[PDB]
Design an enzyme around this catalytic site. Structure first.
Site, PDB file in Angstrom:
ATOM      1  N   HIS A  49       0.822  -1.203   0.000  1.00  0.00           N
ATOM      2  CA  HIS A  49       0.000   0.000   0.000  1.00  0.00           C
ATOM      3  C   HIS A  49       0.860   1.258   0.000  1.00  0.00           C
ATOM      4  CE1 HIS A  49       0.896  -0.562   4.287  1.00  0.00           C
ATOM      5  NE2 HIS A  49       0.690   0.737   4.415  1.00  0.00           N
ATOM      6  N   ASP A  63       0.614  -8.599   1.981  1.00  0.00           N
ATOM      7  CA  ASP A  63       0.726  -7.143   1.903  1.00  0.00           C
ATOM      8  C   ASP A  63       2.172  -6.652   1.829  1.00  0.00           C
ATOM      9  OD1 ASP A  63       0.094  -4.389   1.980  1.00  0.00           O
ATOM     10  OD2 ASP A  63       0.192  -4.387   4.175  1.00  0.00           O
ATOM     11  N   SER A  95       4.108   1.593   9.495  1.00  0.00           N
ATOM     12  CA  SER A  95       3.782   0.439   8.670  1.00  0.00           C
ATOM     13  C   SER A  95       4.964   0.114   7.767  1.00  0.00           C
ATOM     14  CB  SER A  95       2.531   0.718   7.835  1.00  0.00           C
ATOM     15  OG  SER A  95       2.664   1.925   7.101  1.00  0.00           O
TER      16      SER A  95
END
Lengths: 184, 184, 184
Positions: free
Chosen positions: B44, B74, B144
């Site tokens: 992302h 991810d 993240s």
């Protein structure tokens, strides 16, 4: 190589004693207190319960009996058929919890399972009618009715919902449990 | 006088290996894994990236190549031109992360820069399709794709977004990185 | 039996120096800095104050005088009539706070009273006009203007409101206090 700073020791001795509570009509946490098979939990968990089901981390599953509860302290006491060797929550009634002490919050949310969070004793004292314990360890429905223990694993309190979390001092929770075992 | 309780040691050996990731078209964190110049991050972050730019804490700035990613976990793998001496994230594949272990979350949010937060391993196990690591250290977009290490600095996981934070176990993240280096 | 991991030591030496601040017209925290009776706090607490009232943890209650404040750093300095023996906040100007160091946040919210929360130094550096300290210890109105100390109890900063909390480095807060004692 070396040894990582860790409060795993406290987990091994306390966590197996913390339990999942279910409804099975046609969810919260609890704490095995003694060999007799007495378990502490929360009222808002077992209210209007049809059949109470307790599940240990070792894989054993029992049907629990509701001994009694206390709306004031939100606590409730269950009773399961204690068999051969139960995991019980370490207790030291000679231990005086001090503010700043490291504590671990133990609870098995219906989502993730057993979860340990870490903080300290933020504050104590009285705040109500007749005694609380505040902590910055996460305390929600996921671990409500769960245990709160120090780095030694000794029971400090029972997680409750009365950035700050609350617990009921083990010294008081004991007394309350004992009285609920009354059977007029 | 004396020595303050501190997990700074872990910071000095792990933090220099954690990196800022930028887009520079006409933002997240990452982790230098090996001397070859391979860096782990999040999908992302680098999705629809035009030019990927990596920035180390020592002041060096590179342009990164996207090796490959994995929508399932991810994760994503970048590749920068490794020069003379790179800071790499300490790794111990013989270390077994235990629940209750102290962990530090390392990430450089676009706002404040490198930020270290502290917690413990709350839980592990599987929860998906084919393995996670839960922790009460703050884990947001700011960190993240960042590192999650123990008090020794050893890599425990890669911060992810799958009061509770998640990471991908270093043992799995390794395997995933290795496979992404495949070039049909 | 044994000894629980605890940062109570830091509490005993630092906490008695942290204070409740009141308005008594017809609420926040503060920190006794020196024997002379100088106390640090926050502007947003003592703004438009009619009568400032300071309350110590030992039971003593004084009326405070507003020396001066600083809108830039949001700090304010009060002055109470120092009597026989005041509790002062431990200070070490030779101590260099390192990132990752354990810190305790001390403040007496109007609700619960003195509350200690625990975290670490997340980050430092500059971010403004002319110096901050970031931490993952809870920092809200309840402990604003309060102390932030290491595991030794040494003052690291003054909790401010400029998942992440901020404090003003004790080295800067000192200088600011000293200058506010100016009386053109």
């Amino acid at each position: 190589d070396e040894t990582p700073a860790s409060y795993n020791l406290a987990v091994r001795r306390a966590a197996p004693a913390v339990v999942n509570v279910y409804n099975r009509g046609l969810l919260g946490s609890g704490v095995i207190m003694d060999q007799r098979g007495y378990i502490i939990t929360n009222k808002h968990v077992i209210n209007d319960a049809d059949q109470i089901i307790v599940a240990l981390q070792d894989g054993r599953v029992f049907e629990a009996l509701l001994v009694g509860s206390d709306s004031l302290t939100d606590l409730a006491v269950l009773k399961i058929n204690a068999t051969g060797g139960l995991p019980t929550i370490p207790i030291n009634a000679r231990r005086v919890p001090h503010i700043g002490d490291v504590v671990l919050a133990i609870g098995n949310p219906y989502n993730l399972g057993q979860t340990i969070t870490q903080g300290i004793i933020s504050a104590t004292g009285r705040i109500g009618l007749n005694n609380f314990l505040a902590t910055d360890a996460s305390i929600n429905h996921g671990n409500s009715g769960g245990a709160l223990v120090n780095s030694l694993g000794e029971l400090m309190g029972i997680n409750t919902l009365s950035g700050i979390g609350f617990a009921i001092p083990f010294q008081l929770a004991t007394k309350i449990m004992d009285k609920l075992i009354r059977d007029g």
